[PDB]
């Protein structure tokens, strides 16, 4: 016999994956999903996805097992930087903007968003951080905007060595695929190490 508790709603997964505009990479929006049923079928009838990689769990086994404390976070990255959203990679995004731990249990979903997150003669609303004193510890957000000094002379204001750390991907519609925008939603959750709060299809 299987006994699962009383439930009300169907989790706000549609409300995250289909929004008007996502957040920038340096200040990625993170949401919590709890006290609902998490059906991973509404994600499949969304887009012909570019990267759907799951670590620690099979994509087809996602409905009949359950878990706790799921975290969903979203951001918009450059085309050639999608492979950096993985445990154990390096680069500009993976060291200064968004780090995943080596032992990661979750999924990464990415799809093309050129028809919406791009305007003619520049779409300067999507920023990323390029200069930081040190690497980023897994799952840490740095929204600090302060002049970065890359020279011996102490920096007082923008100067030949003083550089603002945030640069803006210039999405434009005629670019090739490797520079085109991509929306990335990363789901993170813990398996069988805590009492469960969300499980999904009841019976």
């Amino acid at each position, epitope marked *: 016999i299987v006994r699962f508790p009383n439930v009300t709603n169907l989790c706000p997964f549609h409300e995250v994956f289909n929004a008007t505009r996502f957040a920038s990479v340096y200040a990625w929006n993170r949401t919590r999903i709890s006290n609902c049923v998490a059906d991973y079928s509404v994600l499949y009838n969304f887009a012909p996805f570019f990267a759907f990689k799951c670590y620690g769990v099979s994509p087809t086994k996602l409905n009949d097992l359950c878990f706790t404390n799921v975290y969903a976070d979203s951001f918009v990255i450059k085309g050639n930087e999608v492979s950096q959203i993985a445990p154990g990679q390096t680069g500009n995004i993976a060291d200064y903007n968004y780090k995943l731990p080596d032992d990661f249990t979750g999924c990464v979903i990415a799809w093309n968003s050129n028809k919406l997150d791009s305007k003619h003669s520049g779409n300067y609303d999507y920023w990323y951080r390029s200069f930081r004193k040190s690497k980023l510890k897994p799952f840490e957000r740095d929204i600090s905007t302060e002049i970065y000094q890359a020279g011996n002379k102490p920096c007082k204001g923008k100067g030949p060595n003083c550089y*603002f750390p945030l640069q803006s991907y210039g999405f434009r519609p005629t670019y090739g695929v490797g520079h085109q925008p991509y929306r990335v939603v990363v789901l993170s959750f813990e398996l069988l190490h805590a009492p469960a709060t969300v499980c999904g299809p009841k019976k």
Partner: nanobody
Amino acid sequence: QVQLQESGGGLVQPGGSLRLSCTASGIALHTHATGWFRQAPGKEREGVSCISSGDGTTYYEDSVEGRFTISRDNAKNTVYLQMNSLKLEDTAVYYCAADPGAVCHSGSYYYTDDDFYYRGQGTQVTVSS
């Protein structure tokens, strides 16, 4: 506000040479894409050269191929245009512009579409007499 300042120009003679320089104040020209554009009187602006973000693939226009050389020094954060064997029709005013990303020749796009974000004041280059 990030500003780009040019330097150079003068009274060069046909067969001479000049080195135009463009120095930034707030951005690293090794993470942005730089370029040059020119204005002869009575005409419309046309590109000269470009460097991409990393390492740098140099692109040149048909009018100035083989004669001009584009290069960047990452210590002084200044891009250089070494112009060799200037002809009398090359008199114009030159502007340096920058844009985030490897903007020159990505896909079906090219830097002749004059839509860079950062730009400058310009320096007059004349060659005659």
